[PDB]
Scaffold this active site. Structure first.
Site, PDB file in Angstrom:
ATOM      1  CE  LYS A 167     -32.477 -20.043 -55.311  1.00 36.65           C
ATOM      2  NZ  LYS A 167     -32.236 -20.994 -56.435  1.00 36.65           N
TER       3      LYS A 167
ATOM      4  CG  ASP B 106     -28.905 -28.748 -56.974  1.00 34.85           C
ATOM      5  OD1 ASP B 106     -27.808 -28.293 -57.355  1.00 34.85           O
ATOM      6  OD2 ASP B 106     -29.995 -28.194 -57.215  1.00 34.85           O
TER       7      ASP B 106
END
Ligand code: A1ACZ
Length: 385
Positions: free
Chosen positions: A71, A199
């Site tokens: 990613k 997050d």
């Protein structure tokens, strides 16, 4: 049947999660080892390709051929300074194919090279098969999430990973948007609603500020640290226990790769226990030179060990507020995402910063993104008919 069904996938940096919305509820789907999240790992061995838990479980034994962090590469050019900096910290090889990075490994005794979207497609194929084993039929329609800061090339390469994986990508949606959908923050009627998503995952920290105006989402600000996460806290526990072993036995274990990895996984486990108990016990048989390591640690000591790192999470919160041109009292909702937000000290620091405010944390924070993606996938497949 299968055509009227859609899944939501959180394709995370360190873990991935898949959900399905049916019969009025989201079901976060457990994998074949009973885990609700699956490591974003792909291992290439002398006989097979492993994905998820089995891939993460043999990382120490096969580090050159165990791929993770795809990613961080997806949608980027080889010459990108992010790629050049990250490459120095990976045990797997990253090669250049016409300014496009490829991860190069040994598989079944042969040299093979894969595009980041091919690695991510193997993780996605696993999530698709996990959903299919649960449902009892193949599901191919999916919503896949991405960070709010992903550009068009990163979004397109994530969609390409979905296509390679045999998924019909209904939409690529932002992770903090999926989290706000999970809490139904887009269905509060009229008027602009400001939402802050905090997050803190395994390897990255993202702060996002969104404005929801009559169902329409707008990203006002993104901030954070791409190299701050749960694994840094595991590493702070490791250094403590390495120093304690040295005090008790007058032996340095830091060079014994096996001793350090067994301590690291035990530390990660103890860290999780410390989120619901005020102490955690380590029970390592024959850690180094036949010496057992049976010890414990308080939540107070763990909080001291990570104090600077926990406190550093507030700078991107303040930065996001200034970029969004909003004061604290102008934020309507606070949402927790990422397994590390379960840490009580982290919740306390954020709540105190927002002057004693309640936090949205009832949904498993490592599952909130897949939960929202699953809700959106259901709405989108229903509109398609
Ligand atoms: N109970 C917990 N207390 C603290 N950290 C936790 C917890 N659960 C998870 Cl997952 N993590 C961590 O979250 C990351 C994945 O999102 C990993 O770093 C995992 O250790």
């Amino acid at each position: 049947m299968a055509k009227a069904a859609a899944i939501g996938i959180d394709l995370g940096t360190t873990y991935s999660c898949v959900g399905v919305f049916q019969h009025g509820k989201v079901e976060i789907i457990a994998n074949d080892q009973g885990n609700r999240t699956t490591p974003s790992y792909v291992a290439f061995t002398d006989t097979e390709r492993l994905i998820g838990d089995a891939a993460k479980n043999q990382v120490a034994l096969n580090p050159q051929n165990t791929v993770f962090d795809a990613k961080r590469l997806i949608g980027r050019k080889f010459g990108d300074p992010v790629v050049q900096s990250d490459m120095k910290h990976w045990p797997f090889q990253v090669i250049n194919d016409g300014d496009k990075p490829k991860v190069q490994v040994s598989y079944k005794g042969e040299t093979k090279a894969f595009y980041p979207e091919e690695i991510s497609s193997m993780v996605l194929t696993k999530m698709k098969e996990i959903a299919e084993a649960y449902l009892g039929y193949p599901v191919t329609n999916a919503v896949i999430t991405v960070p709010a800061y992903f550009n068009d090339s990163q979004r397109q390469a994530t969609k390409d990973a979905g296509v390679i994986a045999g998924l019909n990508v209904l939409r690529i949606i932002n992770e903090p948007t999926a989290a706000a959908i999970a809490y139904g923050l887009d269905r509060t009627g009229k008027g602009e609603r400001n939402v802050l998503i905090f997050d803190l995952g395994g390897g990255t920290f993202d702060v996002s500020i969104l404005t929801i105006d009559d169902g329409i989402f707008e990203v006002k600000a993104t901030a954070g640290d791409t190299h701050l996460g749960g694994e840094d806290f595991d590493n702070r526990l490791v250094n403590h226990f390495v120093e304690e072993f040295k005090r008790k036995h007058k032996k340095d274990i830091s060079q014994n790769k096996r001793a350090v990895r067994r301590l690291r996984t035990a530390c990660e486990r103890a860290k999780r226990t410390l989120s619901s108990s005020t102490q955690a016990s380590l029970e390592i048989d024959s850690l180094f030179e036949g010496i057992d390591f049976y010890t414990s640690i308080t939540r107070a000591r763990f909080e001291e060990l990570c104090s600077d790192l926990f406190r550093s999470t507030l700078e991107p919160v303040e930065k996001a507020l200034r970029d969004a041109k909003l004061d604290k009292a102008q934020i309507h909702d606070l949402v927790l995402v990422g397994g590390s937000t379960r840490i009580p000290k982290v919740q306390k620091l954020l709540q105190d910063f927002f002057n004693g405010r309640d936090l949205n944390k009832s949904i498993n924070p490592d599952e909130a993104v897949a939960y929202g993606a699953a809700v959106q996938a259901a709405i989108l497949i229903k509109s398609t008919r």
